[PDB]
Amino acid sequence: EDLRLHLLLNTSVTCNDGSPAGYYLKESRGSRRWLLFLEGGWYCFNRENCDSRYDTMRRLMSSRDWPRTRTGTGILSSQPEENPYWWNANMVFIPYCSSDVWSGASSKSEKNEYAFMGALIIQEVVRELLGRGLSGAKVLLLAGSSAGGTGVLLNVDRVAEQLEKLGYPAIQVRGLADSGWFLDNKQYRHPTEAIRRGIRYWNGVVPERCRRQFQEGEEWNCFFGYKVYPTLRSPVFVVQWLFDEAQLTVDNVHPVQEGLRLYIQNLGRELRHTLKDVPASFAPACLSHEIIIRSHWTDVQVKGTSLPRALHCWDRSLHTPLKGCPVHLVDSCPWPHCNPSCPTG
Numbered sequence: 001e002d003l004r005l006h007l008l009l010n011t012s013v014t015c016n017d018g019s020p021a022g023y024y025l026k027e028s029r030g031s032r033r034w035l036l037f038l039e040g041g042w043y044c045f046n047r048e049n050c051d052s053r054y055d056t057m058r059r060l061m062s063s064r065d066w067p068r069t070r071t072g073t074g075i076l077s078s079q080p081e082e083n084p085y086w087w088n089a090n091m092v093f094i095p096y097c098s099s100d101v102w103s104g105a106s107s108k109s110e111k112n113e114y115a116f117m118g119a120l121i122i123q124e125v126v127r128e129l130l131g132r133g134l135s136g137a138k139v140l141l142l143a144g145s146s147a148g149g150t151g152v153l154l155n156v157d158r159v160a161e162q163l164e165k166l167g168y169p170a171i172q173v174r175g176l177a178d179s180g181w182f183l184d185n186k187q188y189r190h191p192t193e194a195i196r197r198g199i200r201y202w203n204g205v206v207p208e209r210c211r212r213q214f215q216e217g218e219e220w221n222c223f224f225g226y227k228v229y230p231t232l233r234s235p236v237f238v239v240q241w242l243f244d245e246a247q248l249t250v251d252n253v254h255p256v257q258e259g260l261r262l263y264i265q266n267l268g269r270e271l272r273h274t275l276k277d278v279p280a281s282f283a284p285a286c287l288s289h290e291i292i293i294r295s296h297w298t299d300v301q302v303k304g305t306s307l308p309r310a311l312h313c314w315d316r317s318l319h320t321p322l323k324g325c326p327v328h329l330v331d332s333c334p335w336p337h338c339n340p341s342c343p344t345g
């Protein structure tokens with residue numbers, strides 16, 4: 001229980017229900033590395049389905065019941081045994097309480113039952129951390145899982161621009177997007193519509209270069225990794241199971257026959273294709289969901305390299321490829337669990 005809760009001092013930056021947003025922090029006095037992690041957990045895109053989420057997922061919509069501390073796990077652990085990559089970093093966990101894939105910039109008001117302020121929560125956390133040590137940082141890694149992974153892609157360049165404009169051009173902003181790289185593909189039995197309605201309901205914002213390509217009405221495109229990633233300037237490491245459970249869910253996939261076998265194999269092939277030109281990526285051939293804040297995140301390997309090792313090699317590459325220190329690790333085998341190191345479940 002080593003990360004301590006701080007509610008935002010700017011109380012106009014709120015969770016869905018108007019309660020203040022916040023962050024959990026464990027400082028590491030010696031370190032100039034900062035890890036800011038965006039929690040995930042789907043989203044809601046109209047009054048009805050947000051009302052339902054408020055009944056049974058209220059911690060994702062409100063800070064009123066948050067605990068005063070959280071234990072850092074996986075990449076947020078301070079133990080080198082659990083976190084070979086960044087155990088000595090300053091650790092920040094940002095709870096997801098905006099239900100907007102971290103894209104929203106809209107307040108609760110007479111016109112809005114809910115506030116959707118995810119993009120502003122990130123900006124405010126960064127602003128308040130600069131007075132707590134972030135001003136002395138050399139690397140700010142914006143990480144995230146699930147909706148938080150997509151949130152990394154939507155916000156990493158805005159964090160970089162924010163620090164540049166505040167007068168901190170020496171902080172290197174990087175992104176780590178875990179399980180947030182989705183395909184706008186055809187369902188197996190009859191995602192783009194959800195995001196389309198979400199953006200209007202949230203007043204959602206997307207990165208500028210991507211917005212300029214797709215333009216008004218088509219900004220939903222920028223929520224899909226393979227479309228937004230080529231527009232980004234900050235270095236982004238992409239972690240994505242080839243057969244992500246959430247992708248299969250939105251594809252309406254739940255003794256597998258030929259049609260479904262071909263569907264699943266084509267999904268893995270398409271995911272692999274979208275990662276071909278992503279130099280820093282870790283994509284195992286597993287049916288699973290999220291990775292980087294679980295305690296046993298060290299166990300999975302691609303081509304004999306673990307994710308903590310891949311991320312360390314990424315660090316080195318950002319100091320020609322490195323001998324025995326790869327950063328591009330995408331499985332080529334075509335079926336869930338053809339990789340023996342996949343999570344057991």
Ligand SMILES: OCc1cn(-c2ccc(Cl)c(C(F)(F)F)c2)nn1
Nearest residue numbers: 041042146147150182191223246250
């Ligand atoms: O916790 C599971 C989960 C999945 N998602 C998510 C994020 C972005 C997109 Cl773009 C999509 C989809 F389905 F639209 F592709 C889903 N968010 N949280």
Ligand SMILES: *[C@@H]1O[C@H](CO)[C@@H](O)[C@H](O)[C@H]1NC(C)=O
Nearest residue numbers: 009010011012013117120124
């Ligand atoms: C507080 O947040 C709002 C955005 O919701 C912003 O307009 C305002 O300037 C902030 N001001 C502070 C913290 O001084």
